[PDB]
Write a protein that binds this DNA or RNA. Structure first.
Ligand SMILES: Nc1ncnc2c1ncn2[C@@H]1O[C@H](COP(=O)(O)OP(=O)(O)O)[C@@H](O)[C@H]1O
Ligand SMILES: [Mg+2]
Ligand SMILES: [Zn+2]
Length: 685
RNA sequence: GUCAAGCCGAGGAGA
RNA sequence: UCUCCUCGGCUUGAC
């Protein structure tokens, strides 16, 4: 039933007899289909030889497992073989190693594999080896770089390859390694300023995958072009000539707080260097115990966030953001005040009497349809133009950086009627990150959105970086780029998603940022890498071989050194040689001896002395903890009945017993000293 | 069928 | 060395 194309045949041809190789063709050229044909050929070959053989497909995401368990492998190969798709959300029943030798055609998110490998290498948890396979197939090879996921697998593969080659000249017995087929669209250039460094990068990839060719289509090209096309590029620039009543109204507050602080930014309001200045200022102030300087740092950081979204989003969203923030703040203050406690503050009183007195005003200055936003009006024009031009023949995708962005966009495009009168149904899309003010999403919710859009029930999918790679849509036209430039790969992989006729690509930039600049940079890199590929394809085989062997050895030796600096590198097993203080206030909290651990992940104290100090701010089981001063400390945790209040070290501050170089660490794993697990013998009767 | 929390690794961007 | 964003994975719990 599965049908082929000609160029598919010629590009596949060498892989059909050994030849572990790489492929790169433009998006939507049957890469999956040619892979599927190679699967069928491989296994039929191994059976007609009466030999054993199995296949593992690797992706770098969680949708693609079921994407390709639904649409391309399973519908064609169900008859002759069993198939199974694995991800980070499919509740298995057996384990991974057992299904290595049960279903015979697997598909996996990557890290499942490496987990099982290092389990086989560390303990007796069953695990798996590479000799338990006959073929690895890869999608989106180009992530094979410095310390990525795929790279560890290929490091182990190359190590065993060199062992095989050392046994080539020492013994007869050697292990037959599995074949490797890599697929991509752009192997991509890793930050090279020239054509030659880019060539070197291609060779680094190819040696990190044990390649022999690339096999770009050149012969059967008319077939491609009559069958495949590209969109038309389009730039959309918009400049500001407004924002003096609102934006400057906030820069006013910034100057006011700085003149309350006596601290010079020495840079511009509304950027990242200003942020970094505030961050280091805060870290030093907490390293000094100085209040009045960390706190305006944190607030000015919030104002900078508000400005940076004001570069992208209306006044109203930032008003909402800081409304949530100071709402939480006043909640903490009232919770402290409402707990045999009488005291008042001077800083926080100043900040709040500075803000809330302008809260109503800024809400009044928020709602103004005149200067809503340049880029937003521009996309209104672009969108409505397209969705009027197509007459129900639309399928939309939108990209951006953050998620709060996406939520606001979906909300507001549900609000406005010019978008609803056309009936451009909308929904956003994100990866399962349980960290935001935003409400997170679920895997099943993601898949339902995929199905509703492929159904066409949604007309525009707002998507974060989960949606550059994959999402084999049947046919869509309109894709855009809301003020985002990362590299050449995101550009090309998004610019080729309109798998349909009369496709378009768009960028939406502000003139006050080097964005279209990097647009052109990525364009040049795209032109550059094809020339580099044409160079290496015409390379001599023996010279190619020598170079890839060099780079294999370089990758393996680099691992070893990165291992040498990580043998221990910090092994002071100093249990309680510290004191943890609060960070806002310089209030002592705990020592190291009262601390214990659960699950060898979570660090906690479980003594009444730490108990009778904090407050539980209400929304109910997982409660949030706060300080007496007003600092947030941690979250509750009900572990085996024990109501242990766990915390985050990033909120607290260090003070050693020896000489007190106060520091911040941002996470537990970084620091040297060790804490023990908690024997439950305590807290009994 | 629902929800919450924390931990870790990696990439990209910027400085 | 720092920051931001993003992604993938792992455990605990509650309905
Ligand atoms: N042999 C074939 N004949 C016709 N169309 C094909 C064939 N093989 C694949 N396709 C088309 O290719 C599309 C899949 O492209 P795909 O390779 O998944 O994109 P990407 O390369 O970005 O992963 C499908 O929509 C399908 O219609
Ligand atoms: Mg693909
Ligand atoms: Zn405190």
């Amino acid at each position: 039933e599965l049908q082929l194309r000609p160029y598919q045949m010629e590009v596949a041809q060498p892989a059909l007899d050994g030849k572990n190789i790489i492929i790169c063709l433009p998006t939507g050229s049957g890469k999956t289909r040619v892979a599927v044909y190679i699967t069928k050929d491989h296994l039929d070959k191994k059976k007609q030889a009466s030999e054993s053989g199995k296949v593992i497909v690797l992706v770098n995401k969680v949708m693609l497992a079921e994407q390709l368990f639904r649409k391309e492998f399973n519908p064609y190969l169900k008859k002759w073989y069993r198939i199974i798709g694995l991800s980070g959300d499919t509740q298995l029943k057996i384990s991974f190693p057992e299904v290595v030798k049960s279903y015979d055609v697997i598909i996996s998110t990557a890290q499942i594999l490496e987990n099982s490998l290092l389990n086989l290498e560390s303990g007796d948890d069953d695990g798996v080896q590479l000799s338990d396979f006959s073929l690895i197939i890869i999608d989106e090879c180009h992530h094979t770089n410095k310390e990525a996921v795929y790279n560890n697998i290929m490091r182990r593969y190359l190590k065993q390859k060199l062992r095989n080659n050392d046994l080539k000249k020492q013994n007869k017995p050697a292990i037959p390694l599995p074949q490797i087929l890599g697929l991509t669209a752009s192997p991509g250039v890793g930050a090279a300023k020239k054509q030659s460094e880019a060539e070197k990068h291609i060779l680094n990839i190819c040696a990190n995958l044990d390649a022999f060719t690339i096999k770009t289509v050149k012969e059967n090209l008319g077939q491609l072009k009559h069958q495949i096309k590209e969109p038309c590029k389009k730039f959309v620039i918009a400049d500001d000539t407004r924002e003096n009543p609102f934006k400057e109204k906030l820069l006013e507050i910034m100057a006011s707080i700085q003149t309350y602080c006596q601290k010079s930014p020495m840079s511009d309001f509304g950027t990242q260097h200003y942020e970094q200045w505030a961050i280091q200022m805060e870290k030093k102030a907490a390293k000094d115990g100085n209040r009045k300087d960390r706190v305006c740092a944190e607030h000015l950081r919030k104002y900078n966030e508000a400005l940076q979204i004001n570069d992208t989003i209306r006044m109203i969203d930032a008003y909402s953001h800081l409304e949530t923030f100071y709402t939480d703040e006043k909640e903490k203050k009232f919770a402290v005040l409402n707990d045999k406690s009488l005291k008042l503050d001077e800083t926080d009183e100043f900040l709040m009497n500075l803000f809330f007195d302008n809260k109503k005003m800024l809400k009044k200055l928020a709602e103004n349809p005149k200067y809503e936003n340049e880029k937003l009006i521009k996309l209104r024009n672009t969108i409505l133009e397209q969705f009027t031009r197509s007459e129900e023949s639309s399928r939309g995708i939108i990209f951006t950086k953050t998620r709060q962005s996406t939520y606001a966009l979906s909300q507001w495009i549900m609000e406005n009627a010019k978008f609803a009168e056309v009936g451009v149904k909308a929904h956003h899309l994100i990866g399962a990150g349980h960290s935001s003010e935003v409400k997170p999403m679920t895997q099943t919710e993601q898949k339902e959105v995929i199905s509703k859009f492929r159904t066409g029930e949604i007309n525009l999918l707002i998507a974060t970086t989960v949606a550059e790679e994959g999402l084999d849509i049947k046919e869509c036209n309109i894709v855009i780029r809301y003020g985002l430039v990362t590299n050449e790969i995101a550009m090309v992989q998004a610019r080729g998603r309109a798998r349909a006729d009369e496709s378009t690509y768009v960028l939406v930039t502000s003139s006050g940022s080097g964005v279209t600049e990097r647009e052109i940079v990525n364009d040049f890199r795209e032109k550059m890498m094809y020339k580099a590929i044409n160079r290496v394809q015409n390379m001599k085989p023996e010279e190619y071989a020598h170079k890839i062997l060099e780079l294999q050895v370089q990758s393996i030796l680099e691992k070893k050194m990165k291992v040498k600096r990580s043998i221990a590198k910090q092994y002071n097993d100093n249990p309680s040689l510290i004191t943890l203080l609060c960070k806002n206030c310089s209030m002592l909290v705990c020592s190291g001896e009262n601390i214990h651990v659960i699950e060898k992940m979570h660090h906690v104290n479980m003594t009444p002395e730490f108990k009778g100090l904090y407050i539980v701010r209400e929304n109910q089981t997982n409660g949030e903890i706060i300080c007496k001063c007003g600092q947030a400390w941690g979250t509750m945790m009900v572990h085996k009945g024990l109501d242990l209040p766990c915390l985050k070290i990033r909120n607290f501050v260090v003070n050693f017993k020896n000489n007190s170089p106060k520091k911040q660490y941002k996470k537990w794993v970084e620091l040297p000293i060790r804490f023990p697990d908690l024997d439950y013998s305590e807290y009994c009767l």
